[PDB]
Amino acid sequence: METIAKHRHARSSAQKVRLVADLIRGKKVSQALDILTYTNKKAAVLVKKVLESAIANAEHNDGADIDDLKVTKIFVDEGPSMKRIMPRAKGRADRILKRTSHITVVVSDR
C-alpha cells in the first residue's frame, strides 16, 4: 500500500482519466513522468501530479527507496454528484453531467 494521494476534482468523465493509467504498473516507476508528461492530455496531467506527490512523500515519510515502490494497481472512482444546464430544448435534454475523477493510486513495492 504505502500511499494513496488521489487528487480531486476534474471537469471530464471517468473514461478520459481511464486511458493511460495502465502502462505504469510494476516495471516503470524509476522514471514515472515521461510516458504521462509526453502524453499531455488533461487526463494524463492529473495522473502525473497524483504520482509525484505520492512517492515524494513515501521516500521521506516511511523511509523507503524511491526506485523500488513498483506501483502495483492504479484504480478509478467518480463522484459524489455535479450538474449544470444548457437550454437546447428548455424542458427535455438540457442538463449536462460532470462525473468527476479521483485516482486511487495504491503504490507498494517489487
Binding site: 486511458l19 493511460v20 515521461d34 510516458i35 509526453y38
Partner: protein
C-alpha cells in the same frame, strides 16, 4: 430515431483496441538534467551548448 435497444454492455464497452497510445522511450543526458524532453533538449529556450536561439 429514439434510443430503443441494448445498453453499452460487453461488445460496446469492450471497444479499446484502436483508442491506443505510444509507449515511447527517453534519453537521460545530463547536458540538460531535468528541463528536457525525450530527445528535445529543453522545453522552452532551445539549448545545446552555447548561445543557440534564445539560450545563454
Amino acid at each position: 430515431a429514439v434510443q430503443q435497444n441494448k445498453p453499452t454492455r460487453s461488445k460496446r464497452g469492450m471497444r479499446r483496441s484502436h483508442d491506443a497510445l505510444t509507449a515511447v522511450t527517453s534519453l537521460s543526458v545530463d547536458k540538460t538534467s531535468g528541463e528536457k524532453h525525450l530527445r528535445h533538449h529543453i522545453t522552452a529556450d532551445g539549448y545545446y551548448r552555447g548561445r543557440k536561439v534564445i539560450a545563454k
